[PDB]
Amino acid sequence: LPGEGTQVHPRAPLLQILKVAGAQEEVFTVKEVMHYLGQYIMMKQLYDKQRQHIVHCHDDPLGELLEVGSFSVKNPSPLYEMLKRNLVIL
C-alpha cells in the first residue's frame, strides 16, 4: 500500500462504506481511509462487546469486501489485502 501523503480513490463498494461513516470526498490518503473504516465499525458496533479487538463483519457489507466473517485489529492483513483490491493509486 502507498505511503503517507499518497492519494487514493476507493472503488464503488468501498466508497459506499466510507460514505456511511461520513466521508464527503472521493480522494483520500490511506490513513484517512482507515479513519473512516474505524468510524464505520464503531458506529455500526461491529466490534465484539467483550473483546473489542475482534470485529464481526459477517452479514455486513464490510464482510463482503474483507471476504472473512471476523478479523482481529491486531492481525490486520485482511484489511490491507482488501484495500489493495479496492484502492486506485493516484
Binding site: 490513513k31 482507515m34 479513519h35 474505524g38 465499525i41 466490534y47 473489542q52 485489529v73
Partner: peptide, 14 residues
C-alpha cells in the same frame, strides 16, 4: 479492557 476506538487508533497511527 481497551475500547475498539483506542485499539483501532493504535493501528491507524502505527
Amino acid at each position: 479492557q481497551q475500547t475498539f476506538x483506542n485499539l483501532w487508533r493504535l493501528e491507524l497511527q502505527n
